[PDB]
């Protein structure tokens, strides 16, 4: 990516809740040990575009 140094530091300094938007059905079906909140939101109709 063409980010500068300062842009890289800024991006690393704030953590995004999503970390991407492609969370497939198989992923939420397979991670039954770990309860991510995003899977619950997606299963209850709450999507982040």
């Amino acid at each position: 990516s063409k980010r500068s140094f300062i842009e890289d530091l800024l991006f690393n300094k704030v953590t995004l809740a999503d970390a991407g938007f492609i969370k497939q059905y198989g992923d939420c079906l397979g991670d039954i040990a770990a309860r991510d909140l995003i899977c619950a939101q997606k299963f209850n109709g709450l999507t982040v575009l």
């Binding site: 909140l37 619950a40 939101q41 209850n44 709450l46």
Partner: protein
């Protein structure tokens, strides 16, 4: 918003399956109406805050 799905809202239970398995559609419809009203209220509160 996800956490607010654990509220009776005056219904006998907060789970649709429990209501539909204990009560037939005869008396289940009023309970499901109460749940629908409450959850729609929760969604409206979320949308207003947004």
């Amino acid at each position: 918003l996800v956490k607010q799905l654990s509220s009776n809202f005056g219904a006998i239970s907060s789970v649709l399956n429990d209501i539909l398995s204990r009560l037939d559609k005869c008396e289940a419809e009023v309970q499901i109406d109460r749940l629908i009203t409450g959850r729609l209220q929760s969604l409206q509160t979320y949308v207003t805050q947004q």
